[PDB]
Amino acid sequence: IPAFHPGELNVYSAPGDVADVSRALRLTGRRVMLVPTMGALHEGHLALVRAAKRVPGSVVVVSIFVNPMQFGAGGDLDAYPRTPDDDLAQLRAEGVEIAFTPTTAAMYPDGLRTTVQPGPLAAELEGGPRPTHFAGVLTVVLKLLQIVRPDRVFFGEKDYQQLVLIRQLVADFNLDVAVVGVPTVREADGLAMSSRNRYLDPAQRAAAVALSAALTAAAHAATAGAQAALDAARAVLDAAPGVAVDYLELRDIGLGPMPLNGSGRLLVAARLGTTRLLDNIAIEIGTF
Amino acid sequence: AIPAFHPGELNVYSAPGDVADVSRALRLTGRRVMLVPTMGALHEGHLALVRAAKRVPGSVVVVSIFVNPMQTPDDDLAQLRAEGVEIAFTPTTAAMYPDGLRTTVQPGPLAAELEGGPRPTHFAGVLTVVLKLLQIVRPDRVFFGEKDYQQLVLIRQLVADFNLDVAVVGVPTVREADGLAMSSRNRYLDPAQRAAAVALSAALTAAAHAATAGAQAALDAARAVLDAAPGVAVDYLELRDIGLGPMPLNGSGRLLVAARLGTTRLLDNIAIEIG
Numbered sequence: 001i002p003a004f005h006p007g008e009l010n011v012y013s014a015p016g017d018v019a020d021v022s023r024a025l026r027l028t029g030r031r032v033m034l035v036p037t038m039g040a041l042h043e044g045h046l047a048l049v050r051a052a053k054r055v056p057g058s059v060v061v062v063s064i065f066v067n068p069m070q071f072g073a074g075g076d077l078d079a080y081p082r083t084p085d086d087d088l089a090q091l092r093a094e095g096v097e098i099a100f101t102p103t104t105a106a107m108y109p110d111g112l113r114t115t116v117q118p119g120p121l122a123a124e125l126e127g128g129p130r131p132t133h134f135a136g137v138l139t140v141v142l143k144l145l146q147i148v149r150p151d152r153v154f155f156g157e158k159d160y161q162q163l164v165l166i167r168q169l170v171a172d173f174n175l176d177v178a179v180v181g182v183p184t185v186r187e188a189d190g191l192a193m194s195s196r197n198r199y200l201d202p203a204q205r206a207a208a209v210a211l212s213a214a215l216t217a218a219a220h221a222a223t224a225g226a227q228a229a230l231d232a233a234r235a236v237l238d239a240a241p242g243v244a245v246d247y248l249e250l251r252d253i254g255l256g257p258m259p260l261n262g263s264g265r266l267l268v269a270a271r272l273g274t275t276r277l278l279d280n281i282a283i284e285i286g287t288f
Numbered sequence: 289a290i291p292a293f294h295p296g297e298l299n300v301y302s303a304p305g306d307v308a309d310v311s312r313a314l315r316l317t318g319r320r321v322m323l324v325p326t327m328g329a330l331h332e333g334h335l336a337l338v339r340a341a342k343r344v345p346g347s348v349v350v351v352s353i354f355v356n357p358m359q360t361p362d363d364d365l366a367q368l369r370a371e372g373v374e375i376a377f378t379p380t381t382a383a384m385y386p387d388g389l390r391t392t393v394q395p396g397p398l399a400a401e402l403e404g405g406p407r408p409t410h411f412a413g414v415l416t417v418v419l420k421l422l423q424i425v426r427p428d429r430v431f432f433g434e435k436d437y438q439q440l441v442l443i444r445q446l447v448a449d450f451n452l453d454v455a456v457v458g459v460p461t462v463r464e465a466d467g468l469a470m471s472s473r474n475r476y477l478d479p480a481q482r483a484a485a486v487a488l489s490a491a492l493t494a495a496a497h498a499a500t501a502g503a504q505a506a507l508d509a510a511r512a513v514l515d516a517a518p519g520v521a522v523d524y525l526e527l528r529d530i531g532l533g534p535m536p537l538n539g540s541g542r543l544l545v546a547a548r549l550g551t552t553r554l555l556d557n558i559a560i561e562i563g
């Protein structure tokens with residue numbers, strides 16, 4: 001067991017180190033909370049941390065790992081924002097006691113070998129054009145879960161499809177962890193928090209409010225039915241300068257092979273220049 | 289409340305939740321949880337797995353019996369009770385797959401070789417169910433026979449690749465008196481086939497001893513023995529390193545054979561040391 005100093009930010013790179021500390025803590029009665037991140041931390045991540053902090057007797061582990069296995073692509077991996085110094089500063093500010101910052105070598109010493117094969121959900125929406133993306137996500141999340149063995153793991157609702165898939169991973173592999181989804185933190189105008197927001201110029205930043213505007217308009221239009229909700233969202237996206245919509249789709253909450261009932265999720269993906277933005281919202285139809 | 293558990297008796301659970309709760313309760317009291325996964329119809333090979341598991345001080349032994357779709361009940365339990373096994377886990381297909389087939393394990397490239405030739409997807413099924421069983425039971429050690437060697441290596445790859453906190457224990461293959469590897473298929477062999485089937489183990493043992501003369505001597509010895517058997521259609525005879533990569537010029541390896549006799553496929557494998 002490596003050194004662990006309570007009340008301070010302890011940073012471990014070796015999977016075996018955090019595993020050992022985690023297990024030692026769990027045996028002393030502490031409940032281990034995991035917030036898995038790819039770094040470049042914003043207020044949305046801090047909301048995950050805070051949710052974890054508030055579980056009584058918790059110790060919070062924040063993982064930071066830019067997982068090469070979930071990138072296509074050529075350049076996407078290299079282009080991903082990396083701001084390590086700010087990240088750890090934020091964790092210290094928030095009173096986090098463990099950051100887990102493994103190397104690529106430690107996570108993938110044998111390269112890609114055994115992997116998670118997601119269900120059919122991974123071939124839709126975000127996964128349509130990116131066929132191995134969610135296999136990459138689920139493989140890393142499985143590994144982080146096995147390494148840290150948390151009682152609860154925290155994810156934002158912003159990447160809703162990812163969240164659903166992770167719930168599938170946990171159910172389908174009988175993992176002994178509770179998955180906690182945390183509502184999307186937004187800028188004051190309603191823009192969903194995102195690492196990618198930094199890539200919007202002032203004009204694109206202005207236009208980008210249209211995603212959240214469209215979703216919230218649809219959620220209130222929805223007393224008038226599905227068609228009205230979708231048409232309200234489409235109108236708002238269409239009014240916005242330089243927003244190219246990739247999909248706007250209304251699905252059941254599990255996004256699964258079932259028709260929408262009264263309760264749904266409306267999901268949007270759109271491009272502003274080269275920046276691709278996602279957002280989603282709970283929809284009640286007829287309210288209902 | 290924890291499901292009822294009576295120490296020193298055979299406790300049978302069909303609900304994954306029940307065995308999970310009891311195993312956790314047991315671990316917290318100090319017991320080391322040992323898992324022996326099976327598809328039932330228990331034979332001496334399985335009892336060797338059980339006996340290995342029981343040897344660990346402070347062990348509680350969990351034997352799962354589950355016929356995986358993706359890859360005698362009363363006698364089975366009698367045998368386990370006779371061995372002093374305290375937990376049998378006997379789930380339904382529905383309990384194991386309540387949402388059907390969805391998230392699964394994708395084996396690495398090794399699954400496409402050797403047995404993955406006649407059965408490209410077999411190992412995906414095995415690895416998925418083994419992972420589920422490990423997660424439900426959370427054993428300290430899990431026990432497999434060495435007879436399905438490729439399977440065993442893929443399991444160890446699963447454990448490595450997904451950072452599982454279980455120790456994988458390979459137990460030497462139990463064999464009939466003439467050396468035939470124990471298998472549920474052996475009973476279907478007519479007497480001519482049962483006689484010929486001894487060629488698999490005989491070829492592999494001859495090879496292991498021929499190996500002082502080198503790799504080619506060992507392989508040629510094996511082949512000559514197989515060539516002396518009628519009605520034995522050899523699918524492969526392959527010498528590999530112990531992880532089933534290419535055999536190094538010298539050192540430890542494994543020699544693997546598969547053959548068809550009439551309609552039954554037989555496999556065997558053996559440790560080989562080169563030179």
Ligand SMILES: COc1ccc2c(c1)cc(C(=O)NS(=O)(=O)c1cc3ccccc3o1)n2CC(=O)O
Pocket residue numbers: 036037038039043044045047048137140141155156157158159182183184185192193194195196
């Ligand atoms: C509570 O409000 C919000 C709002 C938006 C949020 C978040 C919280 C969190 C993210 C986010 O992405 N985090 S992540 O990239 O570090 C990540 C890494 C990772 C690794 C494994 C599994 C899941 C994983 O998620 N985001 C949106 C964003 O950044 O675009």
Ligand SMILES: COc1ccc2c(c1)cc(C(=O)NS(=O)(=O)c1cc3ccccc3o1)n2CC(=O)O
Pocket residue numbers: 069070112115131132133135136139394
């Ligand atoms: C529908 O169009 C396509 C196009 C290419 C595709 C697929 C579908 C499916 C795969 C695929 O499953 N490859 S894999 O099993 O070796 C794998 C690679 C990988 C990478 C990161 C994470 C997990 C991973 O699992 N591939 C890539 C391929 O065949 O090479």
Ligand SMILES: COc1ccc2c(c1)cc(C(=O)NS(=O)(=O)c1cc3ccccc3o1)n2CC(=O)O
Pocket residue numbers: 325326327328332333334336337414418432433434435436459460461462469470471472473
């Ligand atoms: C120590 O000496 C031996 C010798 C031969 C042996 C074994 C032990 C065990 C088996 C065997 O296969 N058992 S199994 O069918 O119940 C099985 C359960 C299971 C669970 C998960 C994955 C694969 C699985 O396969 N066999 C060979 C046999 O019976 O054919």
